[PDB]
Design a protein around this ligand. Structure first.
Ligand SMILES: [Zn+2]
Ligand SMILES: [Zn+2]
Ligand SMILES: [Zn+2]
Length: 98
């Protein structure tokens, strides 16, 4: 115990798990993720790397959150019409966009 083993940021003892030295200082796993994690425009919560972080057009999305508003199909790396707050299939989008 010569050195200190606490998240230099939350100062909470690292919880039963490995840790990252951030700012030359131990940070709890969560810190590293929450700090640089991306926000899921669908959930609004940071997307940790411990999950499928879908990245499309400098934006981020849970591979499960990215879907069509009508077919609820999971559009990923697939063509989609980006609506103001929704995503649709170029088939459904062209159905209303018309
Ligand atoms: Zn922390
Ligand atoms: Zn999400
Ligand atoms: Zn659709």
């Amino acid at each position: 115990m010569t050195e200190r083993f606490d998240c230099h940021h939350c100062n909470e003892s690292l919880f039963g798990k490995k840790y990252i030295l951030r700012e030359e200082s131990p940070y709890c796993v969560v810190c590293f993720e929450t700090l640089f994690a991306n926000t899921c425009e669908e959930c609004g919560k940071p997307i940790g790397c411990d999950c499928k972080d879908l990245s499309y057009k400098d934006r981020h999305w849970h591979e499960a959150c990215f879907h069509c508003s009508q077919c609820r199909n999971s559009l990923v790396d697939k063509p989609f019409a980006a609506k103001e707050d929704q995503l649709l299939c170029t088939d459904c989008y062209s159905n209303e966009y018309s």
